[model samples]
Target: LHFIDQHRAALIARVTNVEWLLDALYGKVLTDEQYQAVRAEPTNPSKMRKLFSFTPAWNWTCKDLLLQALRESQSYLVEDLER
Candidate 1:
């Protein structure tokens, strides 16, 4: 997630908009199997919480990076929204 935030400006340029609502939907609408898979991994629980919980900025780059991280490892939880 740090890596994503670091390059947020660049990522936003690549993708014009960051769809936070969609991200939240992804987290909220996941199936039981999908949710279980993500929850089963201790690392992802926090990240999932963050994705659904935060008021994300309009930085598509950072959002993309975070999305990519989830794709890579559903267990890579993100605990901080202070930024």
Candidate 2:
């Protein structure tokens, strides 16, 4: 998780696909808050589609750390989603 966060800037720069960004950003498990936040925001489907082009690991721990950050930020409704 730390490794990915530390290198996120480079990763985003290298990865042009939003799905890959979203995949890496969310780390696979889609929480309700994250889903809502993502859904509410304007999404670039083309970019998201591009993410599918690359293989992403579902077990990426980065996703959990991201969720924790989101929870701390109050950006994502973690408790509501946990239900």
Candidate 3:
């Protein structure tokens, strides 16, 4: 079970600082264009949505990268969800 999938809605709603997560995932999990597209979103929620939108194309490894990024930036939320 992927953490990204298990907590998508909660993450999107609560992830107020998306730029850091994007930066963390950049050049690895996220492509240049995908980064740009996520950055192009006007708000945090939108950016989060844009980020998750790309996950359908991602494998478990990629999704775990996303989970790792989220854990880096939003550990409290991840901890809450984990419990």
Task: Return the top candidate by TM-score.
Answer: 3
Candidate 2 matches the true fold with a TM-score of 0.31
Question: How far is 51's C-alpha from truth in model 3 (Å)?
Answer: 0.7
Model 1: residues with Cα > 4 Å off, grouped in runs: 16-25, 28-65, 69-83
Provide the overall lDDT of each model, using Cα atoms, as 2-decimal numbers.
Answer: 0.42, 0.44, 0.86
Write down the lDDT that model 2 would get.
Answer: 0.44
lDDT of 2 by residue, 47-69 (tens): 43333223254345555555454
RMSD to the hidden true structure, all candidates: 12.8, 13.2, 1.2
| TM-score, every prediction | 0.27, 0.31, 0.91
Top lDDT prediction, candidate number: 3
lDDT per residue for candidate 1 within 38-83, as digits (tens), equals 4443443343443334425425554555566444443323223122
Candidate 3, residue 69: CA error in Å?
Answer: 1.4
Candidate 1 global CA lDDT score:
0.42
